[PDB]
């Protein structure tokens, strides 16, 4: 015997394993096979709205156009300035989209390594606690600075001799608050181009306007 | 083993002609004329004394047949619980035939209608919520067997008996009335089912037009054999909110269970005016008086307000409460059953509309005929 | 389930050319071919379809044949060349249905759980739009018969596409653009007064069919109910519209 | 066993299931391989840069011609392989 | 090899589930499909084999196709249950063979009947002289149980043929315990 | 040899499958085959523009799969009629639709296949009712 049930379980196990694995691989190549006919679209940006059907956009690569929405694009979402998608050929607006990121911002956004906090530094607790007073108090409790009714400070300039831990102070805050440390090294900004670094400044200030508790840092200003 | 029918071959007059044949049925290993023989054991006119004997042998038929449908096994375990008269051994057998049977012909719902069919002794509150609802949860494939829909009336109507949702006797009545098609059970019990169908349909007041579908055959054959006024006072709840002989004749004949719903039957005649005043009357008259609402409604002047506002709580009408003269303005209403004279007079004013708009249409086209080119 | 359809006339010509494929040979009953379709929303679309050989003998209306191998091979071709397309149902050219059509429908609902048919007419003169949609579902019955499986008239329309009439309106050559202001209104007057109220007279002919006949499903469910939606206006003699002539004067006011 | 002989009928039945395994596996396999022969043999490949990967599984492309293109459909890669 | 077309008419009625025949009646009719499908493998592969039934429906799952390993996969979950109507089984088998690919194929059809059919001898003589006017030879193997000696299908055998066209061979059912290969051992000898 | 004035009859489902085919593959040139009937010398009809499978690497003569010729044309034989091909279609969406070098590369193959082998050129973005592209 009665080993035919064992041989039937062996051939059924290998056959069902080959069917599930290789046919499921034909399902992954079936979905990946279905996505072959798709064509990428155009990144455009709405300059303004002309009429109910006419729309003034300018794509990033060059000239200006007026087209219409598709059917259900929800034209009230088209505020002047939004990033939308255009057809390659019809060139009409395909889909209202969220904003661009310029991942040079991301290369200083997600590249904050781990660090020991402000206990590792010492002897400059005036700068430590004072920086806590100027930064952490208006972001946590603005109403102490609003009960008096006077504007809190915004910008701070670390200076002194070389190697007084001016880097590792902001690094220890970057292991203390851990919110949105946009640490600009401020020497790899310019590459060759004309208003490219300017456009990076606009993107940093708009993204900085967006994620409301942003922390701007800029090392080595003297190059720029 | 044939020795079980050597001792159980005697069950009635002329009996072993199917037992000496039966020992050719299963000994010659055919099992579907033995499915007809399980149908014969369901059929057997006796005290049904051998079913508690045969039940282990039918368990054996389920063992070394292992293909037949357990519909007839439920139909024989109702006989076995009729012979043994205790549900718990067929609850062990019921859970047994629920855990060992996964047969392709709707084994799960015959098991849930086995819980519904054997539910009558285990109490009908702890369990009617879970598995009676699980019958139509498991009826997701195909509600067209009509055995599970008739039994589904049976368990859903025991759920009507243990009182919950009186107004579910209309849809529950659409499950018996929507299960049975030809009479297939005695008329001299059916007319009592139409008797309590009108009574419990009068208890369930959510649809309030209970003479709605009464060109239905396996109730109307009972409408012509029951007391004839009960249908007529359901027609005094369907058409005419008058004849105190009728809407009081349901107090003359039907003594109990009237005062519990009596003000709401006053409410139902006080919406029966609301179909009368614009359905039957010429057009709307644009403004309908407290004498019409109150006189048809057999109520005072100072209840037509609560009548029409309560009608706006129902939502059958959207009428404006014109009571600067106590004379109510009309809007759209939900209609009532189209009678044949309503068909014919509807053809009169409807054909009147048809050939007037068409005739005057052709006249306007005749005036505009010269400007085409 | 279905909201409505979107049907281009291209697939209707894909019915017409196969009607030319069968009009030269012995036409037994009619055409039954595949209706491919683009189903995205509860609305429908059809850009293409194809046909398949079919005969039927009218003795039990159950001996009838398609080729599912041909259907899935050419469906493999068309699915291969277009990943958007899938089957959505079938069609028939004889404008009246019959009893076998539920066996056609339910026999091809195994591929997709809906299989909508299309009535067309190769010689239409009386209908409005040719296209028609059903769905084979149940309202059980009021009496609850054993599965009264019923076609349901889902509403239907001619679909449209940008740059599909590049052939069409160049072909026909007869179009008078913007006849607003001249006689289009009275074309619609003759055809809606006459061709609306004659349909009203066939509905009152069906009312006489309920008088002398019509006990089948006398239909006291939808007829007086949506006819009470019609009876929002009981326009009897004396006309009762005193609250509509200052309304009419307000309507005539600004235009005059 | 009789259950052993019916189990041998289940062994030939599982052999038919192996024939369906090679059929549905190798058939749709080699077909979709041929579609990858069509798509993936387009050997001039404009390399580009990932700007963002939106999730509405979508990505925005900056070509080496310094231009922008949107795609809602990523392609023959994984989102884990796509860092900014 | 030889050009023909054979439409296997399996029985899927609720009598074909028991074990009076060798182990399973599904196995009896199934092994009958095995020997006729391997028999058409031994015949011309230009010929085509398609499945049809008589009970509860006239089921075309496979086209009348020269492939048969697909039908070998269609041996599974046949579920014999329903009400026999073989009289439409002749006509559905015939227009099933009137949507063929070539007329050089002859028309010799087998049939698998295993339940009492409500067939009139007038009905099978309309179908039988219909097949006189349609040039089809049908060799029926009775399964299941309808008669210990099948009579109406004997009348279909007699009324199908005369003097030239005796391609009506009727293996009447031995409805008691008989083998899965002893019933089909006679048509593989002579159809 | 002496040569008579020719003529191309249409069935206009040709034009519908060109607008729908070139509309479907609108950012790309397509290649296909045109079916019809060789009626005589001075006329020839197109009765079927039918779908032809995509090339991804190169729109060329290798876009004609011969097993799609046997399977496609044979399943047209078991469609209502086995009619004869009358040529071949393609598209040029990217420009004003003139004869690419592919067309002269496969024209000798197409007239090795057929008598006439008449081109079909189109830009699918031209008009909505007007142009005869
Ligand atoms: N107060 C301190 N506590 C702990 N570690 C310190 C301290 N000061 C300096 N260090 C260590 O010595 C390193 C030198 O500091 P670093 O030079 O990065 O600061 P800085 O801002 O770069 O000064 P500068 O840029 O002017 O040369 C720090 O990165 C840290 O590892
Ligand atoms: Zn080209």
Describe this structure in words.
Chain C is an alpha+beta fold. Helices cover about 35% and strands about 10% of the residues of chain C. Chain E has a three-stranded parallel beta sheet. Chain F is of the alpha+beta class. Chain F is globular and about 40 Å long. Classes of the chains: A alpha+beta (about 220), B mainly alpha (about 375), C alpha+beta (about 260), D alpha+beta (about 80), E alpha/beta (about 190), F alpha+beta (about 130). At the B-C interface, helix 19 of B face helix 5 and helix 6 of C. Strand 1 of chain A pairs antiparallel with strand 3 of chain D, so a sheet runs across the interface. Bound molecules: adenosine-5'-triphosphate and zinc ion. Adenosine-5'-triphosphate binds near residues 162, 165 and 168 of chain A. Chain D: This is 26S proteasome regulatory subunit 6A. Chain D: It is found in: Cytoplasm; Nucleus.
Count of DSSP helices of chain D?
Answer: 1
Assembly classification:
part of a larger assembly
Bound molecules: adenosine-5'-triphosphate, zinc ion
Order of helices and strands of chain B: HHHHHHHHHHHHHHHHEHHEH
Strand order of the largest sheet of chain D: 1-2-3
Would you count the extended β strands of chain D for me?
Answer: 3
Percentage of residues in strands of chain B: under 5%
What fraction, in percent, of the residue positions of chain B are helical?
A: 55-70%
Sheet with the most strands: spatial strand order of chain B: 1-2
Radius of gyration of chain B in whole Å, from Cα? 30 Å
Structural class of chain D: alpha+beta
Q: What's the alpha carbon Rg of chain D, rounded to whole Å? A: 23 Å
In which range does the helix fraction of chain D lie? 40-55%
Give me the strand/helix succession of chain D: HEEE
- The tally of helices of chain B reads 19
Q: Sheet with the most strands of chain B?
A: 2 strands, antiparallel
Number of strands of chain B: 2
Structural class of chain B: mainly alpha
The end-to-end span of chain B amounts to 98 Å
Through-space gap between termini of chain D = 65 Å
Protein name (chain B): 26S proteasome non-ATPase regulatory subunit 13
GO biological process, one term (chain B): meiosis I
Family (chain B): Belongs to the proteasome subunit S11 family.
Organism (chain B): Homo sapiens (Human)
